[PDB]
Each structure stands twice: as C-alpha cells, then as structure tokens.
C-alpha cells in the first residue's frame, strides 16, 4: 500500500535553473531582480505542488489562495535551506544549479544580512541532520502554519489536513533508522524548528516588502509574485495573520 510519505517524495518539484547572466557585473539591484524572477517561477512550481498535495484541493478556493499567499516565503526559504544543506552543508546559498552564492559574493549592498539569515535556516538542517522525509513533512506543515486571525472558510477541512500532516511528520521520525528511544525528543526538536521559522523568515519578508513598495530601489518583481505580495503585505503589516505554533512562545 502506497504511503503518504512516498507520495510527497514523488510530487516534490524538480529544481529550477535561473538563467543568470554572468557577463554583467554583480549589483544588488540586478541580483535581487534575478532572484525574484527565479522566485516567481519557484512559486508557480509550489502552486502546482500544492494542487497535487493530498487533501489540499478539498479546501475552499479562497483558503487555498490564503495559505499560498501567506506561506510562500517560508516555503521558498525552507527549500533554499534544504538545497544549501544537501549541496554545500550550509556553507553557500544554492539558489539554483546555475546560481550558487558563496560568502564573498554576498557582500553587496543590502545582501549580506539577508543572505546570512538564509544561511541560518540552512544551518538548522545541519545542526539537526534532518532527513529528506522529515524535510518533506515539515514543508507541508509550513504551507499550513500561517492563517488569518479571523479563521478560514473551510476550517474543519483545514484542521483535518493539518492534523494528517502532523501525524505524517511523526511517521517520518519513527521511520528514521534507529530505535524509538528518541522519537519524542526528535518531534520536540523539529516542531521547535517549525515554530522558529516564523521569526527566521519574518525579516526576509520585511526586506521583500520594503524592496516591493519602494520603487526607487528599481528591484523588479514578476507578475504573479507582485500580485501575491500585494495581497499578503497589507494583512501582515496590519497584524491580521497568526502563526500556528506547536509550543508556548
């Protein structure tokens, strides 16, 4: 019988190439615009992933939109963290197979602090030695971990799917090779990591919001990403969104 984890492995999108043009000198504006073009295409792939994620399309369409609009940066930063862990052990930001940013290439204006925060996310995978199946279950949980304070249109469906994936993360921990001796400690550590992602991504989001609204910086955004940010930004800045935390703050 096929398992839900086996399905998460099969539906995970292939890694995209950027098409970065190395012939021009790096500038913060050009690099950020290139990263946003790659990000918009990664978000398209993440939407197709969510459509294929078992249970997700049973949500009301407005809730599917809300969850993707609220969680997109968490999903992208978590996956960047994973690729940087697998490909460089957290030493370089592995945005794409043709766009790998090492510590020297990140000393451009504005870039350094944001890039260090993205490396911090990847360092958590190193510290915890996260398995691929644990990563896949946690990534689903990030899609399901930011909601309106006023609730969702299909709340009972949402509560059921979120509980299903919480159980799946448990299964991924139990199926790591070793014994059951450390399974509660592991679940505690990975849910502490999930809770920490809200803060770790929050600064990335504030930076993205500033580069989006301040047109004088000349950072380009592709169309679907601009639409998503335009909807997400006012809700986040007004304090109308809440993270679903596993632990007391």
């Amino acid at each position: 019988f096929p398992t839900l984890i086996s399905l998460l492995e099969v539906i995970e999108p292939e890694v995209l190439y950027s098409g970065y043009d190395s012939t021009l000198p790096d500038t913060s504006t050009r690099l950020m615009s290139t990263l946003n073009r790659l990000g918009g295409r990664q978000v398209v792939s993440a939407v197709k992933w969510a459509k294929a994620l078992p249970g997700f399309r049973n949500l009301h369409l407005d809730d599917q939109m809300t969850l993707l609009q609220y969680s997109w940066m968490s999903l992208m930063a978590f996956s960047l963290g994973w690729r940087s862990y697998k490909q460089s052990n957290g030493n370089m930001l592995c945005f794409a197979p043709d766009l790998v940013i090492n510590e020297e290439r990140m000393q451009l204006p504005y870039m350094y602090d944001q890039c260090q925060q993205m490396l911090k996310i990847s360092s958590e995978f190193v510290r915890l030695q996260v398995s691929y199946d644990e990563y896949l279950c946690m990534k689903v949980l990030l899609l399901l971990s930011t909601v309106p304070k006023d609730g969702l249109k299909s709340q009972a469906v949402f509560d059921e799917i979120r509980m299903t994936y919480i159980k799946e993360l448990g299964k991924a921990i139990v199926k790591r090779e070793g014994n059951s001796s450390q399974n509660w400690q592991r679940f505690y550590q990975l849910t502490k990591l999930l809770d920490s992602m809200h803060e770790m991504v929050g600064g990335l989001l504030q930076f993205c919001f500033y580069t989006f609204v301040n047109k004088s910086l000349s950072v380009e955004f592709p169309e679907m990403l601009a639409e998503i940010i335009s909807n997400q930004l006012p809700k986040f800045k007004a304090g109308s969104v809440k993270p679903l935390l596993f632990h007391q703050k």
Partner: peptide, 12 residues
C-alpha cells in the same frame, strides 16, 4: 482573475 487563482483553477 488573479494569476494565482487561474493557476489554482487550471487542470493539472
């Protein structure tokens, strides 16, 4: 009418 809604509604 948003691009995200069109993609969510489109056949896979």
């Amino acid at each position: 009418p948003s691009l995200l809604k069109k993609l969510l509604l489109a056949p896979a």
